[PDB]
């Protein structure tokens, strides 16, 4: 008896119906491919999906969801979907015309934060490991994320970050 909670709404998109849930995390996509692979190279509409940052989970665990998967998984923080949608509308509404320079600025400044957020998913430095090991022989790692302060470090499955960050791991043990 757990549940989950919406912490923050990152992006928004229209994608293949069904491309939501656990199979949409960066690591699930790097290991088994994106369930939105081809997408919109002509494909029947999409479904408006939202990229969600979950309370108690680092950004690598971010998943795309629909207003329906959210309601189905009965998650807390549903009010956030309402504010996000309203703010998104307020934002779209001041595109009345804007100057092409206003649109130029918007698209640029939105690519900078876009990239910023991507960095929250890559390990900038392993800082400690666990004494206990998984049946597979993997310990868990305490990770420092790029673009985020040390109060954002989190313990992570060792088999998980090994698939992409075996390097920081090697550098961690190398420094001793």
């Amino acid at each position: 008896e757990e549940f989950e909670t919406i912490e923050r709404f990152m992006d928004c998109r229209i994608g293949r119906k069904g491309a939501t849930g656990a199979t949409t995390t960066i690591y699930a996509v790097e290991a088994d491919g994106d369930p939105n692979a081809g997408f919109e190279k002509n494909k029947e509409p999409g479904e408006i999906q939202y990229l969600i940052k979950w309370k108690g989970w680092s950004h690598i665990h971010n998943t795309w969801e629909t207003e329906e998967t959210l309601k189905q998984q009965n998650v807390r923080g549903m009010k956030k979907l309402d504010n996000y949608k309203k703010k998104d509308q307020e934002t779209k509404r001041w595109l009345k015309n804007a100057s092409p320079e206003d649109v130029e600025y918007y698209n640029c400044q939105q690519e900078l934060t876009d990239d910023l957020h991507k960095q929250y998913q890559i390990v900038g430095r392993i800082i400690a490991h666990s004494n206990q090991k998984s049946a597979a022989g993997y310990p868990d790692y305490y990770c420092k994320w790029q673009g985020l302060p040390y109060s954002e470090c989190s313990w992570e499955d060792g088999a998980l970050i090994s698939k992409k960050f075996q390097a920081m791991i090697d550098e961690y043990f190398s420094r001793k």
């Binding site: 849930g21 656990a22 995390t25 690591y27 699930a28 665990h61 998943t63 666990s130 868990d140 313990w155 992570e156 499955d157 060792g158 998980l160």
Partner: peptide, 5 residues
Amino acid sequence: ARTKQ
């Protein structure tokens, strides 16, 4: 350490 499961 948990993951999307």
